[PDB]
Amino acid sequence: YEHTAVMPNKVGIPYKALVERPGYAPVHLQIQLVNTRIIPSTNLEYITCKYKTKVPSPVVKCCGATQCTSKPHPDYQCQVFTGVYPFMWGGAYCFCDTENTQMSEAYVERSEECSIDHAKAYKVHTGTVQAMVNITYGSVSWRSADVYVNGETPAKIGDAKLIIGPLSSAWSPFDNKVVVYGHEVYNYDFPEYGTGKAGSFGDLQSRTSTSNDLYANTNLKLQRPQAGIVHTPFTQAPSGFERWKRDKGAPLNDVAPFGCSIALEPLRAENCAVGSIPISIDIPDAAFTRISETPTVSDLECKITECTYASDFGGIATVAYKSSKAGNCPIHSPSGVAVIKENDVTLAESGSFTFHFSTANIHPAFKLQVCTSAVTCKGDCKPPKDHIVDYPAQHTESFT
Amino acid sequence: YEHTAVMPNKVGIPYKALVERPGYAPVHLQIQLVNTRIIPSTNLEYITC
């Protein structure tokens, strides 16, 4: 009875399949893939952020030169300068007039915002998708368990053992190269660590926040201070993190395909509705009811009464139930034409009980399996009027 | 279900149409045009006496 089932990847709607175990009473499913969070394999390549030209205070030798050296600070720009007369609080102070030397030095450093407000590149591989699958199973009526997709993983949470996927729809909405910012995720071809052109994205490129080493192509060019005054002309491109916040591109949670949402959290891409998942469950046999205890319902009749050719469960149909015992009777349309809101219907001794459903074909000729009794609920449906609210329960469009 | 209906202009009698909304139970109308007062556009030109 290990109920294999191909199953559409779509998040917010149950998939009430039916266990046709030969010998005992069938049992309905209710498989709602409440989430499709993905979490691909990734690598933190480098944080970037806007620089801060945290200038070390220049040297001023008063009569003669002060040769600079290339200190190992990131992008340590330093250039000796002569021909000053530095006004500092008493007019000038160095008594020479051309031998007055000024050595300006400036290096690039991570902002304090780099720790917290920072873009973040990644080389993104495929990884392994997940889900908090609820099944309000059978008469168990509950399990809300986190699972995987790889087609040999069980998750014995509740009582049922369930194996999912691998899904066929391998579209990772993440590209190979991704930039990430706070919550807005950008599938951007970041240039690389160690290379980013100044002004362009990644002018600062630190491996992480702690990493004292980095790559700072900022085109930081010191110029001589003017007219014998102490200061430090640092001529520099404002960061490619400054832009990339107001001349950027749009976020993947606003431009992705096939229906995904995003988080700066394990780097999941939630709820990506695409393709199918070959899902298979091993039910606990204890949860089964033996066949000789559920009422046999045959010699019945089914008919629509007001079929709504729609998404919400507007389709209805009375069923002239013709039972033997009285009790519950799980139901399902093995044809995917009709999706039913009721998993189970209570029965007195051969009464009648309408259920709700939804279809996509004008003439819904769908079988209905009322606990081992098939029936065609043939009829005709009506279009609605009022179509602006969230996503459907029908999801069965085909040739009609 | 915005129930369009051509409807005879006649005052003192209801017009009990029926709402055939696909999906829910229909509902009857009872439209009685109790009055057809007109009030055209006019102009006081002159009193006489």
> Resolution of the experimental model in angstroms, please?
7.5
Nearest-by-Cβ selection for A384 from B2, B22, B25? B22
Q: Of A268, A278, A276, A280, which is closest to residue A129 (Cα–Cα)?
A: A268
Q: Looking at beta carbons, which residues of chain A come within 8 Å of B1?
A: 385
Burial class (CB in 10 A: 0-12, 13-18, 19+), A341: middle
CA dihedral A350, A354, A355, A357 (to 10 degrees): 130
The structure tokens 């998942």 sit at A277
Structure determination technique employed: cryo-EM
What residues of B are in contact with residue A381 (Cβ under 8 Å)? 22
**Amino acid letter at A153?**
T
| Residue with token string 């030798």 | A61
3-class SS of residue A365: coil
Substitution target from B4, B20, B21 for chain A, most A beta carbons within 10 A:
B21
CB A63 within 8 A of CB A99: yes
Contact A180, A267 (CB under 8 A): yes
Residue B22 with chain A: CB contacts under 8 Å: 306, 308-309, 381-384
Interface of B with A in 30-49 (CB under 8 A): none
Contact A179, A201 (CB under 8 A): yes
The verdict on whether omega for the bond into residue A166 sits within 30 degrees of 0, i.e. cis, is yes
- Among left, alpha and beta (phi > 0; psi -120 to 50; other), residue A53 is beta
Q: Which residues of A317-332 are buried (b: 16+ CB within 10 A; e: fewer)?
A: bebebbbeeeebbbbb
Q: How many residues does chain A have?
A: 400
Cβ-contact A271, A260 below 8 angstroms: yes
Quick count: other Cβ atoms within 10 Å of Cβ A92?
Answer: 17
Q: With an 8 Å Cβ cutoff, are A382 and B22 in contact?
A: yes
Closest Cα to residue A357, out of A3, A14, A7?
Answer: A14
Instruction: Show Cβ contacts of residue A291 under 8 Å, excluding neighbours closer than 6 positions.
Output: A23, A24, A25, A372
Q: Does B2 touch chain A (CB under 8 A)?
A: yes
| Residue A203 to residue A196: CA distance in whole angstroms | 5
